[PDB]
């Protein structure tokens, strides 16, 4: 599994896609994932939540017409989700947050 800051970062730029271990929350839900039970590991072993759109409501991330932001969980293994995420734009700007999108710093 590729689920580290650098790992995923390096992967996105090579391939322009998330590593195989990611799945969207909708897909996770479809598999029986219940956020309140922190059972993700049970229904989809080896997977992490990744690839949903980040609406960037607070305009914290650099904007642009035609720029879409997506997010992915980092350092997840089991149980409840943590606070680490990578933010990637369609033009491949890579940002990180370790505090639940309060703050962001560029990593690529």
From Swiss-Prot:
**Record-annotated active site:** 71 (proton acceptor), 100 (proton donor)
| Keywords carried by this UniProt record | Endonuclease, Genetically modified food, Hydrolase, Nuclease, Secreted, Signal
Keyword Ribosomal protein on this protein? no
GO-annotated cellular components: extracellular region
Intracellular or extracellular location(s): Secreted
Q: Does the keyword Cytoplasm apply?
A: no
Q: What is its EC number?
A: 3.1.27.-
Q: Which EC class, in a word? A: hydrolase
Q: How is it used?
A: Introduced by genetic manipulation and expressed in male sterile maize and rape by Plant Genetic Systems and in radicchio rosso by Bejo Zaden. Barnase expressed in transgenic plants will specifically destroy the tissue(s) where it is expressed. After cell transformation, protein expression and plant regeneration, the active nuclease destroys the pollen producing organs thus rendering the plant sterile.
Example of a GO MF term: RNA endonuclease activity
Q: What is the effect of changing residue 100 to Q?
A: Loss of activity
Indicate the family of this protein.
Belongs to the ribonuclease N1/T1 family.
* Known function: Hydrolyzes phosphodiester bonds in RNA, poly- and oligoribonucleotides resulting in 3'-nucleoside monophosphates via 2',3'-cyclophosphate intermediates.
Q: What is this protein called?
A: Ribonuclease
Species the sequence originates in: Bacillus amyloliquefaciens (Bacillus velezensis)
Which lineage ranks, top first, belong to the organism behind this chain? Bacteria, Bacillati, Bacillota, Bacilli, Bacillales
